[PDB]
């Protein structure tokens, strides 16, 4: 009965400045890897002793991942800014929570893929890992475009894939 | 391993 989580959030900056991005990783309700944007040296850091052994290539790779996520989140907050017809004189936030639950057998029990905006539930992946649950007007658009682009199977490719193996890989180091 | 967002919306 183990789990794994990733909380990646982005917040728009007042006036005229680049938004703040963060990425916190959890393994069995324990923070293990962390990232921030406005830090002096924006990189990924291990939050537990067990991680430090990992090679530098791992760190540079996941750092590039983080940068790509910065750009991604930027484009998406501009997008959602356009969706809800909002002016640029305000501050908003976007959250992405993606994780996995693994049973006693070691095999994946429940995959998690949730996107929220401004403290409200935006779009969420379902237990079947194929469909989408959306609430309001702007979310149905995302659901359509992702039904045509086949997003559920990509996020399923990650969830059933790397998430599990890396989770076990971390559990072995504890 | 962190995931890549990949898809805009």
């Amino acid at each position: 009965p183990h789990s794994m989580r990733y909380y990646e959030t982005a917040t728009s900056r007042r006036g005229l400045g680049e938004p703040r991005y963060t990425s916190v990783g959890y393994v069995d309700d324990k923070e293990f890897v962390r990232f921030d944007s406005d830090a002096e040296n924006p990189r990924y850091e291990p939050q537990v002793p067990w991680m430090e052994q990992e090679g530098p290539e791992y760190w540079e790779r996941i750092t590039q991942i983080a940068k790509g996520q910065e750009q991604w989140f930027r484009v998406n907050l501009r997008t959602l800014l356009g969706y809800y017809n909002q002016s640029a004189g305000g501050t908003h936030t976007l959250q992405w929570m993606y994780g996995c639950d693994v049973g006693s057998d070691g095999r994946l029990l429940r995959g998690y893929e949730q996107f929220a905006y401004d403290g409200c539930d935006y779009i969420a992946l379902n237990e079947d890992l194929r469909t989408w649950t959306a609430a309001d007007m702007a979310a149905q658009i995302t659901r359509r475009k992702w039904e045509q682009a086949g997003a559920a199977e990509y996020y399923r490719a990650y969830l059933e894939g790397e998430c599990v193996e890396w989770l076990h890989r971390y559990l072995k180091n504890g | 391993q962190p995931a890549e967002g990949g898809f805009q919306l």
Partner: T-cell receptor
Amino acid sequence: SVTQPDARVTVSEGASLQLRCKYSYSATPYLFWYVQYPRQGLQMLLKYYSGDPVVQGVNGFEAEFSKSDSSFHLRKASVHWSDSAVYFCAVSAKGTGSKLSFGKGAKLTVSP
Amino acid sequence: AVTQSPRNKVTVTGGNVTLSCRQTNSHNYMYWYRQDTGHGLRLIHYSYGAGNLQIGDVPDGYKATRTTQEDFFLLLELASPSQTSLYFCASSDAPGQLYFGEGSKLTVLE
């Protein structure tokens, strides 16, 4: 890297078609097929991330993925003269999902 | 759609070339490829947003520049006949799902 057996293929019009494609990644990558008609850019024919190994594509194109043989074979029930193009198989490693890698490409000539 | 410029170009060795790539739909990922005989096509450069770059499979000889989200440039400072090729630029709002340009045939002469 992606390996496509033949660069030149010739088939009579109104015949079955299978274009083969094998990759070299142990960890199953994202799989893709693309088409290049003469004097044109490349168009995505079909894609595969996870789930159903049989992927349906536009214009009657299909692709079967074999985890066993690490295969991703393109298939079409019947070919026409309009289907004369160069077909590419593309992959992207896990983590480097937006980084594609194309095969040599198979020039498909369909004798009408 | 995705528009690249110019469609065709002929230059001499040591000449300066610059290929332009503009998209009308604000996709983020942008690509620069070249298609050769017996090599299919190979990734020269690519970018995951404005003001950023990333090295492909064959970066030697080619420098790139991403000024905006919709403008990607592939620069060629020192021209060589080994760089005589057909260059395609691409865009993507999805990992692996690319939108290719019209094409840019270039020939370099000694």
